[PDB]
């Protein structure tokens, strides 16, 4: 009923069981005297299986005794996991006692079948004007958020958490797939300082942990998010749940690491043959179903700034939107710091987003492009040519660029936690009015740090 180690090469352990009792695939094994965990991956005949260590391996010898739990890895779930920090095995690492619950679910599941898919497509409001107009979000879809070299992405994630919570709590879940420990500590401290810690469950997989943890932290977070999704209220409907993964690229990097460790033939670039398989199987559980929905905001780090590598090409078939950040705009004083021209979305269909929305977005983008082209001609010649032409565009796009600015609720250094969670209709109406020309004569410097048209009107009459 118990097996013994016969081979230890790196993190790969071979365990020899009896001919009758051989653990199934994905079973969880525990070594007798230690606190390490192994997960079965293959069966090689004669009662020999190939496993992987769930942690460090130093301190093991051939001949130790291993017992099987006859079940996959199971983690706690429920409301009791809110406000705590847990590892890939669900144990607390915040020094606050054990997690008080008894509901356990496996982390290996099948995707929802074909019939369970939601019978409609709907959008999700966030609060940020630029990302609500130029980069519409999809309820249950996936958002590919790239860009940024030194800008404050983590505070943006926290403010997104607070914005959705103000719209609706949703019981978000954070899963840092290979995150910097100091950045994770900063994120936890800043969430604690804003009392939003009571509606977020956190799973941490560090950079220095074995690659198995780097793969499985996302599975643990996804299982918790699924359990939160499948909780129904008195009406009988489920919750919309937000999920955060710090980098999808690190997930594929760890997958390539593990596949290379297990001795498989590499692919065209050097990845695993099963990149698409693993990425799809993970990504097919992030969907909107009949009861509730699960969204996904994930950072993207393009490998070597090339869009022909398989790493972003595989993901691009799954991202429902694209968002980028600008370092210069961050240094320019505009706190949101989102480049409009690069950032686009697939949800800009005029049938679903609205014909007026489509027209206004396209016209604003074209006006901004006209502003972009004029700078070179200004630097070469000047405004001697541009008289009665292309100057109106200059002022209009000046106020357009200043209008994307927005004060942020969680941040208190530069504003006193303003709401500014205006509906979409306000943003579309304001952009339509600005394009039409009623606010053309309004000074362009009154557009900074303004939420609605009434606020900028009050500013303009104030100065």
């Amino acid at each position: 009923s118990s097996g013994r180690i016969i081979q230890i090469i790196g993190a790969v352990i071979d365990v020899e069981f009896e001919r009758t009792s051989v653990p199934k695939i994905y079973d969880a094994l525990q070594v007798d005297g230690t606190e390490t965990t192994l997960e079965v991956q293959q069966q090689l005949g004669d009662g020999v299986v190939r496993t992987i260590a769930m942690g460090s391996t130093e301190g093991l010898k051939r001949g130790l005794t291993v017992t099987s739990t006859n079940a996959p890895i199971s983690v706690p779930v429920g409301t009791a996991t809110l406000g705590r920090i847990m590892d890939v095995l669900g144990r607390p690492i915040d020094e606050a006692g054990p997690v008080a619950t008894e509901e356990r679910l496996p982390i290996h599941r099948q995707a929802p079948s074909y019939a369970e898919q939601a019978a409609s497509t709907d959008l999700l409001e966030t609060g940020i004007k630029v990302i609500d107009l130029l980069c519409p979000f999809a309820k249950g879809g996936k958002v590919g958020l790239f860009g940024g070299a030194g800008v404050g992405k983590t505070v943006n994630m926290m403010e997104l958490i607070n914005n959705i919570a103000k719209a609706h709590s949703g019981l978000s879940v954070f899963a840092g797939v290979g995150e910097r420990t100091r950045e994770g500590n900063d994120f936890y401290h800043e969430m604690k300082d804003s009392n939003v810690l009571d509606k977020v469950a956190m799973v941490y997989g560090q950079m220095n942990e074995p690659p198995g943890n780097r793969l499985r932290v996302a599975l643990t977070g996804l299982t918790m998010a699924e359990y939160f999704r499948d909780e129904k209220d008195e009406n009988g409907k489920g919750r919309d749940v937000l999920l955060f993964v710090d980098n999808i690229y690190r997930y594929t990097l760890a997958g390539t690491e593990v596949s290379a460790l297990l001795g498989r033939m590499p692919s065209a670039v050097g990845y695993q043959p099963t990149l698409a398989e693993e990425m799809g199987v993970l990504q097919e559980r992030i969907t909107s179903t009949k009861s509730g929905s699960i969204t996904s905001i994930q950072a993207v780090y393009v490998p070597a700034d090339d869009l022909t590598d398989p790493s972003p090409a595989t993901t691009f078939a799954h991202l429902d939107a694209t968002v980028v950040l600008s370092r210069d705009i961050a240094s320019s004083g505009i706190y949101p710091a989102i480049d409009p021209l690069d950032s686009t979305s697939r949800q800009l269909d005029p049938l679903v987003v609205g014909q007026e929305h489509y027209e206004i977005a396209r016209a604003v983008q074209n006006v901004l492009q006209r502003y972009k082209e004029l700078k070179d001609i200004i630097a070469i010649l000047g405004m001697d040519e541009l008289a009665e032409e292309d100057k109106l565009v200059v002022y209009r796009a000046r106020k357009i660029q200043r209008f994307f600015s927005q004060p942020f609720h969680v941040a208190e250094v530069f504003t006193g936690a303003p709401g500014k969670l205006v509906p979409l209709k306000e943003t579309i109406r304001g952009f339509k009015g600005l394009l039409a020309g009623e606010y053309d004569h309004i000074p362009e410097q009154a557009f900074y740090m303004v939420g609605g048209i009434d606020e900028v009107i009050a500013k303009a009459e104030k100065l």
Partner: protein
């Protein structure tokens, strides 16, 4: 019988042992002649081990024993001013090292809840790095470039600039020829910076195991100070050579290779080493010392070095280190050959910690440098067509050229914060716009020398406090305007 074994094969530094049924992973193994090994491969029938000495004296048929121990190195404030090998054995010929404690070489990083944010600065003495890419205590910043670009000079200058800040330093040399190590040690002793520095040497003729294991022992020596309420700074001179040695060891043990023949877990190799540098909270120090140390935090900064091939930063190894670390400092060959020294390329150099690791005055002052350099960068194409350009664009070109000339510096000439503050303030307000592009360095040196010659109290106050108010600005302006006339370059 379970702790005894016989040698079977000997080749290329790898020894296969028959027996040793109780050997653990990473356990030390002793040989007949007084040499030590290390189990790395635990197969079904044999054990593969690397030799930590020289293997030419070992023959088949000898005996090996397991010691039930792990790798350890001496630690404490006695290795300062000493040169040792990868195992802590002195090689400078200055007598035995009297240490009271030893610590393991393989360790885990402190937990996430025990950490703290980074808000204390570290000065390297370079105007370019300090004012645009600041480095804080507990950060991990990478120096990357081509061969013969000046990485070692930057690292050694950073070590030297810690004369008064009172933070210990460690220098690790991997795969270098001993003459360069001796020259570096001599230069360190000349400037008086050897009293608070330790050198770990693994030369090119040393076995690959020592070159692979040196950085971890250096990291433990550095962690000694972090775990007791002080600060430290470690420097690895080449992680590429460590990766090469690890690749050789892995290939000799017949493990499946991948891209560029490197093994699968090079990323793990670098990450589990670079994750050990951080800042810890006061509670961690109180718990570690059992109340001996009460109200202080500790930190450990890392400065790894990576060398690229013809400016190809898309190779297998450099990408992992770039992703792991926070910031990067890029040095370019074309800038070096054009007279720009140091050759920092500000276009693709970042520091994620940012202004949170700066003194107040430098934080207030660096904005003008940033914006001027950006505006100069915006017009690179039309530098050769100055005849056809706008006059305002011409003035922006002028100011960008002046700043680019100002950014130069010599070697072994570190700057205190007061010197950088004075120079940057003089540049910002336009006092440097009436001189030509040439003679800018002479003007800067003359002004700094004058200020240090007659304005000692102000310089001492700025150096020791770092504050910025109306009185300080007025005094600095008065001194600069006094220099502008009634003096020569």
């Amino acid at each position: 019988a379970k702790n005894e074994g016989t040698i079977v094969m000997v080749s290329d530094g790898i020894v296969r042992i028959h027996g040793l049924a109780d050997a653990m992973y990473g356990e030390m193994i002793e040989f007949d002649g007084g040499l030590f090994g290390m189990a790395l491969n635990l197969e079904q029938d044999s054990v593969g081990a690397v030799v930590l000495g020289n293997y030419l004296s070992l023959q088949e048929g000898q005996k090996a024993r397991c010691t039930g121990r792990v790798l350890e190195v001496p630690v404490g404030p006695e290795l300062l001013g000493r040169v040792v090998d990868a195992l802590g054995n002195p090689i400078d010929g200055k007598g035995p090292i009297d240490a009271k404690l030893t610590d393991a070489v393989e360790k885990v990083a402190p937990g996430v809840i025990w950490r703290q944010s980074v808000d204390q600065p570290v000065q390297t003495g370079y105007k370019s790095v300090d004012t645009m890419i600041p480095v804080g205590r507990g950060q991990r910043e990478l120096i990357i470039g081509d061969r013969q670009t000046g990485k070692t000079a930057m690292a050694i200058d950073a070590i030297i600039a810690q004369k008064n800040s009172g933070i210990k330093c460690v220098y690790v040399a991997i795969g270098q020829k001993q003459s360069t190590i001796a020259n570096v040690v001599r230069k360190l002793e000349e400037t008086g910076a050897m009293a608070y520095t330790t050198v770990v040497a693994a030369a090119a003729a040393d076995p690959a195991a020592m070159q692979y294991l040196a950085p971890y022992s250096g990291c433990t020596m550095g962690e000694y100070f972090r775990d007791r309420g002080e600060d430290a700074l470690i420097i690895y001179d080449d992680l590429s050579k460590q990766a090469v040695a690890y690749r050789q060891i892995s290939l000799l043990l017949r493990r499946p290779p991948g891209r560029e023949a490197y093994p699968g877990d090079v990323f793990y190799l670098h990450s589990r080493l670079l994750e050990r540098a951080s800042r810890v909270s006061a509670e961690y120090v109180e718990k570690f010392t059992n109340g001996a140390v009460t109200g202080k935090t500790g930190s450990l900064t890392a400065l790894p070095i990576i060398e690229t091939q013809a400016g190809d930063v898309s190779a297998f190894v450099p990408t992992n280190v770039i992703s792991i670390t926070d910031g990067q400092i890029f040095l370019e060959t074309s800038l070096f050959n054009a007279g720009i020294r140091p050759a920092v390329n500000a276009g693709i150099s970042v520091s994620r910690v940012g202004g949170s690791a700066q003194t107040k005055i430098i934080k207030k002052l660096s904005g003008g440098i940033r914006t001027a350099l950006a505006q100069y960068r915006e017009l690179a194409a039309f530098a050769q067509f100055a005849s056809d350009l706008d006059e305002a664009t011409r003035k922006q070109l002028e100011h960008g050229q002046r700043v680019t000339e100002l950014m130069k510096q010599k070697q072994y000439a570190p700057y205190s914060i007061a010197d950088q503050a004075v120079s940057v303030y003089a540049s910002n307000e336009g006092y440097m716009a009436d001189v030509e592009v040439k003679k800018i360095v002479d003007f800067d040196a003359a002004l700094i020398a004058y200020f240090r010659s007659e304005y000692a109290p102000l310089m001492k106050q700025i150096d020791e406090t770092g504050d910025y108010n109306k009185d300080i600005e007025a005094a600095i302006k008065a001194g600069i305007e006094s220099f502008k006339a009634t003096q020569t370059y």
